[PDB]
Nucleic acid binder design. Structure first.
Lengths: 65, 59, 186
RNA sequence: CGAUCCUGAUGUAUUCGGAUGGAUUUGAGUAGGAGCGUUAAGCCUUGGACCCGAAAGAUGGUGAACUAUGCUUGGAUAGGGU
RNA sequence: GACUAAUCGAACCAUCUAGUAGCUGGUUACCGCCGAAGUUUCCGGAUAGCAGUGUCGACCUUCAGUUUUAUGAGAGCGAAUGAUUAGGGACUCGGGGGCGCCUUCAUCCAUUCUCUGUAAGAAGCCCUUGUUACUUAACUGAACGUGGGCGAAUGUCGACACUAGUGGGCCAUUUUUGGUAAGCAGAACUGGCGAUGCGGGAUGAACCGAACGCGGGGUUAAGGUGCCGGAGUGGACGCUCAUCAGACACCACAAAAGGCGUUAGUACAUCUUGACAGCAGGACGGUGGCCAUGGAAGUCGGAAUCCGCUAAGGACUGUGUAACAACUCACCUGCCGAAUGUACUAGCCCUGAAAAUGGAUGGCGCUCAAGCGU
RNA sequence: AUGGCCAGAAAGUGGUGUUGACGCAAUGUGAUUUCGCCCAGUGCUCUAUGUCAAAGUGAAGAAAUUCAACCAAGCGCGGGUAAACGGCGGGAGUAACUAUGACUCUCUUAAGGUUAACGAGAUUCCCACUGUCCCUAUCUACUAUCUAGCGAAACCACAGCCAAGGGAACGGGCUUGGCAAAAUCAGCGGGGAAAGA
RNA sequence: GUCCUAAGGGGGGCUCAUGGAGAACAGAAAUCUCCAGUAGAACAAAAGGGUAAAAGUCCCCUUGAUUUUGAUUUUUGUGAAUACAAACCAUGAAAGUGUGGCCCCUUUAGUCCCUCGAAAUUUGAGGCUAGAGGAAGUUACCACAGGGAUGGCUUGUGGCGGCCAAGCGUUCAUAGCGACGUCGCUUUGAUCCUUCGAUGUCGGCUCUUCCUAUCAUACCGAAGCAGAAUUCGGUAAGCGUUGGAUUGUACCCACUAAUAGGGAACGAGCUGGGUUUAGACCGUCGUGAGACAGGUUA
RNA sequence: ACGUACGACCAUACCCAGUGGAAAGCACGGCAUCCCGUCCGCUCUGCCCUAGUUAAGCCACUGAGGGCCCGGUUAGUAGUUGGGUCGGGACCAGCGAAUCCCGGGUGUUGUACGU
């Protein structure tokens, strides 16, 4: 789920940040936390807002938020 | 685990309430100096073929 | 109590209104208006009375010595050009600019003296009590330059309205007490 | 037999004494002694303890001939431009 | 945090001092006899198990990782839930609005939907006989003694003392539980290795055979017998020709995969009333069927697709025309002469995806094999 | 100055100090020009109840002792201070133990019409200039080379040709092949070796 | 702070949940009657086990919900449970049943408990017995002792859901997998007003060789390929595959026949970034030493 | 053999329908004084064994009844234990079921007293 993001300038880095490697839905009206205080990084390229949802009885697929 | 609440409607709204909400929210977008309070708790999801016909009639 | 079910059953509480259903949608919202607190840059559409009042406010409330001096100079220039161009009036102008006697800015004090000298004498005359009280305060004030400029103001007041100063209540003995206290002749 | 609990006999410094009986565990106990000294070996403990190896800590002394600063007394540094 | 005698984030000298280290490195003759182990259980450790030396006791009892016989056991969810309420009311101060009166929402209620143990004897069996404070209406029973009489196969120790090392390792078969796109991750028993040499797998921790004093003779296991290499270019019956076959495969590529490669079978069908292939001819009429198209006559399109003459011929299989024409196919007849056609199945073979120094059934090489099956 | 800031084990001890606020001592900022508010918190500082040591006082007891008041400074309470560290709004309505918050309403502001000189500081560009390059060539001296004399060191299990395999993706020794001929000199940096590694 | 953490024993009588059919108001639901009713009720486990003349319910008496001592199981002492042994009882006609509920510090007491060691007493203390209660960071200034530094993988064609279907299975069940396909979600040649996160690092010079997965040259097959220029594909690595711009941080330009892609590194040659010893500054964080979301210089 | 009392296995015995029952034994029955218990002599308890009746209990027989029980098959099949330098499941040595179906049944028996 999470990979370790190393930060710092020394050879010995700090590894408290965790990046989510799977797709996420960040929610409505989402603004990213300050970088000093965000531990869980959800990258913008992995965010989805719609899904291809199939109705089982109607047998139709529509893109829903 | 199986549960009955997976197969129920989670958010419902009526015709008049939806229409009034849309009209009021559109009037709110008319003013650029008026912004909502607690917009994260508001139902903002409700607010937000000629070529095909010609090809169908003549392949 | 540490169990975390997928769905939490709401609990009925007696003596309290029933909770709204889980599928209920609330469309009520509150809006707040954003306003930018910045004046017009050109300041040309306002009437001359509005410029007079705004410059008087700047003279009495500005935190810059040069700004206060320029505002008092603008008011003095309009009063010298036309005494009729006083929408506030002599009483209001005096009431606003009399606390500026004690001001530490010597240039502001000199421009205040010029404003006093260009005020109309017949309108200065009935209000000799308040002006003399401000003279007494700013004249026993500790700063020597403030004392000297306040003595200049008292010289102007004696030149313009001498009888009102020497005949108003407290105009004689209190002024003599302040003079003797500043001179060490007690 | 000793420790623990219950009863309390003859007697009496009438408030001391603890017999007679019981009931449990307990103790490397008794129940026809087995130990003491010494020799040799294995093992354990303490000592530096199979040998070599730290950054260290402490006690008492020696250095300003290098160099850092200060005081005292001395020495030295063409020819042009502005 | 620079300098303080090549020494500075606390100089140099001697001493305490042989400071401490669980960490690193090393730890000295020979032969002989035994000889190991990794959750077994408890809270980083104890402990079971496995070992060696001395003994001692009748080294007495016999027992046994075996067979046979007889007989038994075999935490959570919840119609206590999740919804629906448009139409009906009660509504009234529930809230709120307008003028005590009406209201507008809203309040709810009325409605409804969703069910593995034991036994296989001499210590055993039977008879007689006592003892009792137990028991029975009762020497009526219960134990324990007195006296007497008389058992499946196969193979052949116990208790101490002291001292260890190892006690949550690796691999493999089988079984069981979870999963993954595929890998895989767990437990249980057994075997092996760490501790181990030998023969064969060309070679090698885990494979096969077999475990080891020093020698001689004989015979084999696993594996081999064209040469390297000891032993057969051994014998019988077949299969295969690969433009890097195959000779150690099972896994992946990878599929119900593609082959006008070659064998052996299975099912169905045709056949002297002439099968398959060919050659010589016919392949017609209503009719240029209906609609459409500038034109469309079987053959640019859409929908139907019948009848006659038949030996047989589709309102047509392609070539072709602007449209026709013409040719041809399906089908039939004449010549011929005896076995074929379709689809599967099982073998061997080809392909079924490959990089980058020059190389590998171990090497030469092998083609009625020195390849494959018996 | 019977002082501030420091030294010293102590001292009839010492530095500032042969000194006296235009001085001494501690800091921050760092030429010149230009450039608000808040004492909320934390510091620093000024002024009767609470907290309240030892000594002293009272009671009880036969005493050990126990219990009581009293109880300095500090802390707490109350003020000041932001060229202290810090921080960046205010007021009213509602509400009324304490602290909080929430909720409306309303003002919401310090700053508008000297960057020189100097520099082994860091960066971009232009002209000139050129072997930096197209694209390399040639010359000189000293070496390297050979000779006479003199003469070490690092390093060193043993040695040095490869290809494929050698389960622990290591091979220079093992297996299978290629092959393979004394003894040498100058270069070379692939490999081995080589970095107070 | 209030409330709940459960009544056992003996004897006797009777059946429960529910269904059908009936009785003024009375109906879906009040009480009464019959029949059916293997527990579908109740017993303090909401779908475990066990109970029907009871282990359920009601009635009558009762507190075996009592002392004492061993043994056994769960396994030194416990605690719980199980058969008892002794006493005292309860109930019933009696057999019987009943010993519960179906399964390390602080402090207190001791008459006749013992010591304070020269003797005694009184306070106090100790002992024994029996109870009650309950020690933070930083080091980019550094140092020491050690230990380290998936692979006969991969390539050219998506997922989810639904149909169709050769086939595989399947005839006492007629279910299930399924190639080939197909169907839905992922601007009338537009817009240029939607660039969506370095933890992992690459380049360049020189020089050599190899692979083909061929850009060009050689040859060949097909396409309205008239010619010219091509496009698609095949055999082929013999021979070539360039010069530059841009670091506020990989694409453009030109020449050319063409400016093809890789391996031998990425499972101790030289030189610029990732990249980072010690000096210094700014930003964020921390009371701080310092650390870092970071940026710059040597 | 048939009854009665106490019973052992506890459906081959149970549940639903009909048909019959010599002898005796059962049972239904008749009466509420006493013993006793009820809203009710329904049950229980007391007294009668005379009358009536096999109507019901009970016993026996019947049912292509439901259920239950017992055999064949299923099947030397599924499954399972060891072996191979066996293939890409089959043999070797062995152990070894239950369904589905095809059928049958519809209680044995001890003691004591009687018919």
């Amino acid at each position: 789920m999470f990979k370790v993001v190393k930060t710092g300038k020394k050879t010995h880095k700090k590894g408290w940040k965790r990046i989510v490697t799977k797709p996420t839905f960040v929610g409505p009206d989402f603004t990213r936390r300050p970088v000093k205080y965000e531990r869980f990084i959800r990258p913008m390229g992995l965010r989805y807002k719609k899904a291809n949802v199939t109705h089982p009885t109607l047998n139709v697929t529509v893109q829903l938020p | 685990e199986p549960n009955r609440k997976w197969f129920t409607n989670t958010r419902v709204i009526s015709q008049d309430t939806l229409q009034s909400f849309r009209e009021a929210m559109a009037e709110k977008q008319k003013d650029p100096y008026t912004v909502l309070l607690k917009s994260n708790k508001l139902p903002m999801s409700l607010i937000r073929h000629q070529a095909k016909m010609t090809i169908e009639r003549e392949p | 109590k540490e169990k975390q079910k997928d769905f939490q059953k709401p609990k009925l509480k007696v003596g309290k209104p029933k909770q709204k259903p889980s599928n209920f949608t609330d469309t009520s919202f509150k809006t707040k208006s954003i306003v930018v607190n910045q004046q017009t840059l050109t300041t040309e559409g306002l009437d001359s009375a509005e410029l007079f009042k705004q410059n008087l406010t700047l003279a009495v409330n500005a935190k810059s010595d040069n700004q206060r001096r320029d505002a008092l100079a603008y008011v003095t220039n309009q009063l010298s050009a036309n005494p009729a161009n006083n929408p506030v009036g002599t009483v209001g102008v005096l009431t606003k600019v009399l606390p500026l006697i004690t001001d530490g800015a010597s240039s502001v004090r000199v421009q205040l003296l010029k404003l006093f000298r260009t005020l109309p004498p017949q309108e200065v005359r009935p209000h000799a009590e308040k002006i003399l009280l401000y003279i007494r305060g700013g004249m026993t004030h500790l700063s020597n330059d403030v004392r000297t400029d306040t003595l200049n103001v008292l010289d102007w007041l004696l030149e313009v309205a001498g009888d009102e100063v020497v005949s108003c209540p407290g105009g004689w003995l209190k002024t003599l007490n302040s003079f003797s206290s500043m001179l060490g002749w007690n």
